[PDB]
Structures are given as structure tokens and as C-alpha cells.
């Protein structure tokens, strides 16, 4: 029972390792759950809420998410400082992702 979120969960994409699954809340936070320990590997406060989709890189090194902002956010989990950081923002669309 991964009862860590408190808003609506709009998407949940597993990781290739089949151990870490990234999920997104309605309110704009990504939880990289540890399926085997029910432990939050990471909590990511999204710049803008209303995100419906969460994407997990095949390598487990990146997580992507898309919201009504119509900009896809790419988060680099692995950084030298150890704190998750926005890697790329994909603009050009107009509709919700």
C-alpha cells in the first residue's frame, strides 16, 4: 500500500528494473516509489501541477512528465549534487501532453 501520495494519481510508469515505479499526482509531485520497501526513493515537486503522464527512461536515469502546461519536463535523477534536477523542458506543443 504505497500510501505516500495525497492527491489523485494520474499516471504510474514502471522502471525497466521492475523495482522502481514513478507515479505522478494531480497536484504536481512525482514519487519514485521503491516497490519492495514502500520507501520514497524521491519526491519531486513539479513546477506546475495538473500532470497526467509520467515517463521513466529505460536506463532509470531520466524521468519525464507532461501536464496541462503543454511542456514536457525531463528530470535527471542522477546528478553530482545528488538532488534531482530538471534536465530538459520541451516546448513547441500547444495542447495538453
Amino acid at each position: 500500500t504505497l500510501r505516500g501520495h495525497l492527491a489523485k494519481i494520474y499516471a504510474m510508469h514502471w522502471g525497466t528494473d521492475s523495482r522502481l515505479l514513478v507515479s505522478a499526482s494531480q497536484d504536481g509531485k512525482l514519487i519514485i516509489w521503491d516497490s519492495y520497501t514502500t520507501n520514497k526513493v524521491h519526491a519531486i515537486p513539479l513546477r506546475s501541477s495538473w500532470v497526467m503522464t509520467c515517463a521513466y527512461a529505460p536506463s532509470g536515469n531520466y524521468v519525464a512528465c507532461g501536464g496541462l502546461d503543454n511542456i514536457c519536463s525531463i528530470y535527471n535523477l542522477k546528478t553530482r549534487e545528488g538532488n534531482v534536477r530538471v534536465s530538459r523542458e520541451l516546448a513547441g506543443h500547444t495542447g495538453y501532453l
Binding site: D34, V41, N76, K78, T79, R80, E81, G82
Partner: peptide, 19 residues
């Protein structure tokens, strides 16, 4: 600047400490 750099043994250490 707060930039990032690669470190192989440090990479696997980061993996270990992540879990």
C-alpha cells in the same frame, strides 16, 4: 555553477546509496 561530472565507481556508489 553547481554542475555535475561523471565518476564510475562513484556512479555505482550513488546507485548503492540510492537504495
Amino acid at each position: 555553477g553547481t554542475a555535475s561530472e561523471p565518476s564510475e565507481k562513484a556512479k555505482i556508489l550513488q546507485e548503492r546509496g540510492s537504495r
